[PDB]
Amino acid sequence: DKNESATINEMMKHLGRSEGNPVIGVFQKFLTGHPKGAAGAWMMNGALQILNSGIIPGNRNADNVDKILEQFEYVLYPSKTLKTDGVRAVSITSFGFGQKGGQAIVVHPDYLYGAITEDRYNEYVAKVSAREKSAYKFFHNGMIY
Amino acid sequence: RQQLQVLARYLKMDLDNGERKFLKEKDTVAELQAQLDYLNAELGEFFVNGVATSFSRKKARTFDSSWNWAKQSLLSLYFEIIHGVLKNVDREVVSEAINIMNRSNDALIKFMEYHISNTDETKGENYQLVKTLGEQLIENCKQVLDVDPVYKDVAKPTGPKTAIDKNGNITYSEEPREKVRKLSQYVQEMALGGPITKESSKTVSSTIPRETIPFLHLRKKTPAGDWKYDRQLSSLFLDGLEKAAFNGVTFKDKYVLITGAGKGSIGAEVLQGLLQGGAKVVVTTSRFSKQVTDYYQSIYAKYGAKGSTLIVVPFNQGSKQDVEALIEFIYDTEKNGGLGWDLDAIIPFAAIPEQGIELEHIDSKSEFAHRIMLTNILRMMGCVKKQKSARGIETRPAQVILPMSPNHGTFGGDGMYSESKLSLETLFNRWHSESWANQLTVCGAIIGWTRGANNIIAEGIEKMGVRTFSQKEMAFNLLGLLTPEVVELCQKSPVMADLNGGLQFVPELKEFTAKLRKELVETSEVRKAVSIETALEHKVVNGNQVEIQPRANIQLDFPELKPYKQVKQIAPAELEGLLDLERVIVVTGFAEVGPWGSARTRWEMEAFGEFSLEGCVEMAWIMGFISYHNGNLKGRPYTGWVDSKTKEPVDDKDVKAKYETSILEHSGIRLIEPELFNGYNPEKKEMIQEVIVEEDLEPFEASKETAEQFKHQHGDKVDIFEIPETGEYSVKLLKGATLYIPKALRFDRLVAGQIPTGWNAKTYGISDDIISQVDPITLFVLVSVVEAFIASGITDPYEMYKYVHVSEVGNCSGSGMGGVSALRGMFKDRFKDEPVQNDILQESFINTMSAWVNMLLISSSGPIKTPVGACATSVESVDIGVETILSGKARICIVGGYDDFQEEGSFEFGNMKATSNTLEEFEHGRTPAEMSRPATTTRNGFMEAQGAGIQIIMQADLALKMGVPIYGIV
Amino acid sequence: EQGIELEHIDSKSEFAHRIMLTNILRMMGCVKKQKSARGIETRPAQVILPMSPNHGTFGGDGMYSESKLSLETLFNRWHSESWANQLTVCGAIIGW
Amino acid sequence: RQQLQVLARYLKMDLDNGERKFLKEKDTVAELQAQLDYLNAELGEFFVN
Amino acid sequence: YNPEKKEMIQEVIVEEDLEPFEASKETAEQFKHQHGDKVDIFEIPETGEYSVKLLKGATLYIPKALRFDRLVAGQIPTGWNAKTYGISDDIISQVDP
Amino acid sequence: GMFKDRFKDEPVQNDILQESFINTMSAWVNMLLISSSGPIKTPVGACATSVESVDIGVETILSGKARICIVGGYDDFQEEGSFEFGNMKATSNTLEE
């Protein structure tokens, strides 16, 4: 935890992040625990859900944030969920044994749709609506049976 | 028998020695039990049970991260105002602003300055409102950067209000007082008093009427020894209250010990005020649990000002051992495991209730309550005196704010409550007469009628000029006694604050209260009976709305697709046609299997902390609690969920009420369940010990091949002989042979993040033959892949091949350890010769899961790149899949990661000390739910879990062409 | 009890408090129970309570003052509870 | 010793039964005494006596 | 590792009480925790050790040997040592071959 | 070690778990010889893990996350793996040979 907070803080310092703009840290293993490889996948699922819902879950087990973590001014450690008005990007960071450091960045999907035309977006939306209906019926049929 | 006795006599062996020792110890048990039953019949079951020790140093919880909770509160308020939860600056927003001010510092100022300067006021009136309010709060916090935190209560004062409906329904509400709407006005009314309390630039004390007793006053001991209202002390107290109401009162460098401050009590409000003022408070709780610790954490995150520390400790004020241990823990140095604190105030408000216990009913519970409320309080002050004297402290007294009752036996039927409260008044004289005046100062607060049965009549008691207080008002009055001037007055001489509200002036208060309750109760029953009879008369005279219930409608939660103008506004105008969508990677699907079921249920538990109807029904289906039924059932035709075991119909409304406890108990981080790990009990972990055989074991019948194998192993240390009767073989181990005896190891990692009990691959539709063939990790991966494709909308995996070649769909997911179940099989079950499938090795590979995914669902001949990264294998998989798609050998990729929890991996992590020691967690009083606490002072190991997580990524161009949802951009 | 201040309140002080307050209250409660069981309303027992004029004036007496002062709740309990007909409280404040 | 053990096995005699019962009762004495010492440390020697 | 003699263990049910064998206190407690009432552990006052006596019905593992028919493997030449290439003995002890 | 020697209570190092990971070898290479903070991507492909490694390293270099890469593959021969390959009959029967 100390090393990861320091790494995020150093990234945020070097990349010239505005002071007073800490990255909101999401700790998912307080609830789901630590799987030895499904971890970053669960954190990606949570990050995608955070992006799509604009909701940042809080570390409800964060009884008292470590005083050593106060030095990392670019990191925030919420304890309760935040109904944010939109999350643009999420930084998923994992550290496995054997020096397996890893970072991923998930940007909000809506920044993709600004790269296409109106007609292309409209046909994509229609196809996604039809596919969502088909997926809903398939999912509920398969669930009940 | 005779031969045995002869041999025993020769050996000088006493066969009866064990029996004689047993009879002696049985007599000892009998006499010790006789002593225990005497003490139980004497003190009582309640007293003996209630003196059980509850305090321990390791179980104390510290809260001091106000620097973090300030930013958390600021963001909460910011987003609430933006979303429109708060349209106006109400007293709750003002109180939160005051807390933010109290926690203000330069880093916080920069935080709010950024978040407000970055706010775009043009996005509707809500953004302009939050910008203006944030500018005001920045200006306010800049002023109090260096000012000490102050306890300032801004809640609207509320009086009692009881209404009787036409049908005799009693409703009590805390409606705001029309005359009083600020704490300053509360203090002004308190100074003014009323007609009943009368007897035959300018401070609030100036506004006191002549020849009248304020509702809150201080009493001075007359030379005759009686306590009477005193103008000077009362004026000092009301002036302090006025200052605390208007400026606010700080409690910096004030160390308080408060007992009996649970939720819904006066102590809780006093604790909130102390935390606001900046005090270091040791709060003691007799209900120490996750609920209480979370409550106190929320209280600290909301009110704990800069420099305040909340120490929540388990504590039994009914046991002098706990009293001594707590005082020792508070006063002992941090190096010795204490707090190194010196108490500036003591608030022993701990008490247990007593109803319907008259003189004849005084019993064990009454004696125990008396101990808690008088004897152990006196012991606690004696302990503080002893600590201060041992450390040679004479000039830093602790202010004992004693809770006193104006009424001593007026109501009766309260056991020894009045006895304890009245005997607490000896401390005023003991302060002068004994040698602990310099270590303690007595402040007897006579607490008046406080509103938390006793509330319905509060309005009626106020009609005669008597004043009734709320918990917040009473806490404000009590904290007014901690002002520096009242502290200095207590150090001068012990003080008796009367905060009774004029309740003493009513004659025959007990009888008047009984009359009020009788009147209200009689009116309520008379109205209810008359209404019922009128209704029945109407129904008989005139002869003789359908309510609709929610039903679970589980949504896939595809991303919201906003209109094109809206989605184009946020993105840059130059992005159109700029990006190579073939080179843009998008997560089109995702899913997981974990301790909280699927991604949907895990997300609900993460964000909202509880399951909605859809989440609870999905969890019940996942756990097998409810199965779907369609057809005849008990004659009548039923279509819907039924209990899996009893097969009885269950409605979605009843699903929560029937299975919420079970789902919560058997989901998430919890004690390891051996039924989910093949009878693996960490409390009883099987090992085997090599020993050298010391005598020839008796023959045991064995097969011919088995006997030959035993002979091959042991050489000349075993003997195999055929039995001609049946052709079997007898195996006789000799002296010196090697033997393995099972032994059990008590292992200290008992809690793991486990997939919910009842999770079965058959529930998702995987065949029993596949379940037998593959590992549980492989089953989790298959379910995760299917759910990920469902989230991607790809119901049929071959639908991808309408758009991409079979070589263009890859699987780059992997595991840190792979099929640990198959590894355990091959390494241990084969060693023990248990039945193990011959292909357990190919089932153990880390790439076996991806192989089974491809050759059960995908059929792709695209790139396959199974990574190992320990905990980072999923980011590994994402990176490898992104590079696969960018290189173009794939256009769709299945990324993610998976791993399983098993005995040997858990044990080696415990050997590593990477995981948290569950026995140490229990020593610290941590429950399984709160074992995993990232970014906390007390974190001492990771919480091991199991499951899988899968994502379907592809090119953005391809995702748009297939029309699949896009959850994010990698 | 001699030389038992606040800091010295211990087993002996708690036992003396039991004798002088708690078991006195239990004894009056037992007499009340016997009279009520036998249906006696018109023959109250007069409890002549030993009371101290001084409650903590001298100090160093353990819980003596606590017991003596808590015995004064019986005057109000007599009115507020249902044992008035079985017992009558007579607090004799014994002097020097 | 070996002959005695053979005879005990034939007689279905448990030589260790008395010792096992003694150890159980010794544990019971230990836990009851622990309860008594807790009550003594709590109420005190004077009160209990 | 001899493929001609591959070590295995067989579970058998004890038919007679094995003789006591001296064992440590912790080891005897572990044996008692495993076998429940099927073992008897008694302290030796002379030295403070423990005697562990398995009873009838207890579970026992006796080694047995399996003749395995894969005797030939492609093996790094005998005498290959990491010290020859210069890897320290501490690294050799720490890491796998 | 972790599955059998620990089960038998033989002396086993407490970090045999990290010594068992497939990425432990690459970790030790990096932290004994290379000191690089560049991309680490340990593949598993059974007998094709080396071609997997070459392809992953190629793609790493083409993506530019690396300019030099250590590709290849490694595995060891041991009793249990040999016995399980014999069980699947993938290896040749030496007695038949």
CATH number assigned to the domain comprising residue E55? 3.30.70.2490
E62 CB-contact burial (10 Å; exposed 0-12 / middle 13-18 / buried 19+): buried
Start-to-end C-alpha separation, chain A? 44
Nearest CA in chain C to D44: C11
CB-CB under 8 Å, B359 with C29: yes
Based on its alpha-carbon atoms, the radius of gyration of chain F, rounded to whole angstroms, reads 17
CB-CB under 8 Å, D43 with C12: no
- Chain D closest CA to B56's CA: distance in Å? 15
Residues near C2 by beta carbon (within 8 Å), at least 6 away in sequence: C60, C61
CB B970 within 8 A of CB B878: yes
Residues of A in contact with B313 (CB under 8 A): none
Q: For residue B341, what are its two tokens?
A: 């604190």
Instruction: Examine the domain organization and report whether B98 and B240 are in the same domain.
Output: yes
B107 CB-contact burial (10 Å; exposed 0-12 / middle 13-18 / buried 19+): middle
- Chain B closest CA to C95's CA: distance in Å? 16
Residues of A in contact with B575 (CB under 8 A): 111, 114-115
Q: Where are the beta strands (DSSP E) in B73-212?
A: 161-164, 170-173
Q: For residue B158, what are its two tokens?
A: 């509320």
- d(CA B855, CA B212) in angstroms, rounded, equals 92
Instruction: Examine the domain organization and report whether B71 and B28 are in the same domain.
Output: no
Nearest to E6 among F24, F25, F83 (CB): F83
Q: Which residue has the tokens 């160390």?
A: B255
Tell me the C-alpha to C-alpha distance, in Å, between residue B889 and each of B93, B688, B880.
Answer: 57, 51, 12
The method of structure determination was: cryo-EM
Instruction: Examine the domain organization and report whether B205 and B315 are in the same domain.
Output: yes
Nearest CA in chain A to F38: A101
Residues of B in contact with A18 (CB under 8 A): 114, 118
Instruction: Examine the domain organization and report whether B3 and B104 are in the same domain.
Output: no
Residue type, B268: A
Q: Look at residue B696 and give its three-state secondary structure.
A: coil
Q: Is residue D22 part of a domain?
A: yes
Tell me the C-alpha to C-alpha distance, in Å, between residue B824 and each of A128, B900, C26, C57.
Answer: 45, 12, 68, 78
Interface probe for F, chosen from B879, B895, B898, B915 (most Cβ of F below 10 Å), is: B879
Residue from F47, F62, F88, F95 carrying the catalytic annotation: F47
CB A104 within 8 A of CB B875: yes
- Chain F closest CA to E49's CA: distance in Å? 20
Residue from A14, A34, A108, A140 carrying the catalytic annotation: A34
Residues of C in contact with D43 (CB under 8 A): 11, 14
The closest of B443, B452, B428 to B480, measured between CA atoms, is B443
Instruction: Examine the domain organization and report whether B20 and B123 are in the same domain.
Output: no
Nearest CA in chain B to A56: B607
Into how many domains does chain D fold?
Answer: 1
Residues of F in contact with E3 (CB under 8 A): 79, 82
The closest of B918, B913, B898, B910 to B672, measured between CA atoms, is B918
Q: Is residue D3 part of a domain?
A: yes
Residue from B383, B616, B812, B871 carrying the catalytic annotation: B871
For D42, other C-beta atoms within 10 Å of its C-beta total: 21
Segment (H or E) for B382: helix B376-390
CB-CB under 8 Å, F26 with A96: no
CB-CB under 8 Å, A98 with F40: yes
Q: Which residues of F touch B (CB under 8 A)?
A: 2-4, 6-9, 14-18, 21-23, 39-46, 52, 55-56, 59-60, 62-63, 65, 80-81, 83-85, 87-89
| Helix residue ranges per DSSP H, B715-869 | 761-764, 768-773, 776-791, 820-824, 840-844, 848-853
- How does DSSP classify residue B630? E
Q: Which residues of D touch E (CB under 8 A)?
A: 9, 16, 19-20
Instruction: Examine the domain organization and report whether B85 and B19 are in the same domain.
Output: no
Instruction: Examine the domain organization and report whether B23 and B112 are in the same domain.
Output: no
CATH for D23:
6.10.250.1930
Segment (H or E) for B527: helix B509-542
Q: Is residue D16 part of a domain?
A: yes
Instruction: Examine the domain organization and report whether B23 and B149 are in the same domain.
Output: no
Nearest to E34 among B700, B731, B743 (CB): B743
Interface probe for B, chosen from D29, D36, D46 (most Cβ of B below 10 Å), is: D29
Residue type, B595: P
Instruction: Examine the domain organization and report whether B314 and B432 are in the same domain.
Output: yes
| Helix residue ranges per DSSP H, A15-117 | 29-32, 39-53, 110-113
- d(CA A37, CA A31) in angstroms, rounded, equals 16
CB B365 within 8 A of CB B354: yes
User: What are the two backbone dihedrals, phi and then psi, of residue F67, each rounded to the nearest 5 degrees?
Assistant: -120, -30
Q: What is the resolution of this structure in A?
A: 2.7
Q: For residue A45, what are its two tokens?
A: 């699922």
Q: Give me the residues paired with residue B229 across strands.
A: B219
| Helix residue ranges per DSSP H, B837-936 | 840-844, 848-853, 873-887, 903-912, 918-923
CB-CB under 8 Å, D32 with B36: yes
Interface probe for C, chosen from B426, B434, B438, B513 (most Cβ of C below 10 Å), is: B426
Q: Is residue D49 part of a domain?
A: no
Q: Which residue has the tokens 């060891």?
A: F76
Q: Give me the residues paired with residue B918 across strands.
A: none
Nearest CA in chain B to E11: B832
Nearest CA in chain B to E34: B744
Q: Which residue has the tokens 């509160």?
A: B73
Instruction: Examine the domain organization and report whether B347 and B424 are in the same domain.
Output: yes
Long-range contacts of A118-127 (CB under 8 A, 24+ apart): A118/B564, A120/B960, A121/B564, A121/B567, A122/B564, A123/B963, A124/B960, A124/B963, A125/B561, A126/B963, A127/B962, A127/B963
- 3-state SS of E7-64? EEEEEEECCCCCCCEEECHHHHHHHHHHHHHHEEEEECCCCCCEEEEECCCCEEEEEE
Q: Is A99 on the interface with F (CB under 8 A)?
A: yes
Q: Is residue D37 part of a domain?
A: yes
- d(CA B15, CA B6) in angstroms, rounded, equals 12
- d(CA B905, CA F6) in angstroms, rounded, equals 11
Instruction: Examine the domain organization and report whether B147 and B17 are in the same domain.
Output: no
Report yes or no on chains A and E touching (3+ CB pairs under 8 A). no
- Chain D closest CA to C81's CA: distance in Å? 30
Angle between helices B2-11 and D2-11 (to 10 degrees): 150
Nearest CA in chain E to B681: E34
- Chain A closest CA to F22's CA: distance in Å? 10
For B495, other C-beta atoms within 10 Å of its C-beta total: 28
CB B791 within 8 A of CB B586: no
- Chain D closest CA to C11's CA: distance in Å? 5
F69 has catalytic annotation: no
Q: Which residues of E touch D (CB under 8 A)?
A: 16-17, 40, 42, 53
CB D2 within 8 A of CB B281: no
Any chains having at least 3 CB pairs less than 8 A from chain D are B, C, E
- d(CA B144, CA B105) in angstroms, rounded, equals 8
CB B334 within 8 A of CB B309: no
Segment (H or E) for C13: helix C11-17
CB B943 within 8 A of CB B669: yes
Q: Is F27 on the interface with A (CB under 8 A)?
A: yes
- How does DSSP classify residue B505? G
Instruction: Examine the domain organization and report whether B142 and B181 are in the same domain.
Output: yes
Domain that holds residue B719: 681-747
Residues of F in contact with B866 (CB under 8 A): 43-45, 52
Q: Which residues of C touch B (CB under 8 A)?
A: 5-9, 14, 17-18, 21-22, 25-26, 28-30, 32-33, 36, 54-60, 63, 65-67, 69-70, 72-77, 79-83, 87
- Chain C closest CA to B614's CA: distance in Å? 55
The closest of B950, B545, B623, B962 to B778, measured between CA atoms, is B950
Residues of D in contact with C12 (CB under 8 A): 44, 46-47
- Chain B closest CA to C29's CA: distance in Å? 4
CATH for B352:
3.40.50.720
CB-CB under 8 Å, B413 with C76: no
Residues near C91 by beta carbon (within 8 Å), at least 6 away in sequence: C49, C51, C71, C72, C74, C75
CB-CB under 8 Å, B865 with F52: yes
User: What are the two backbone dihedrals, phi and then psi, of residue E65, each rounded to the nearest 5 degrees?
Assistant: -115, 135
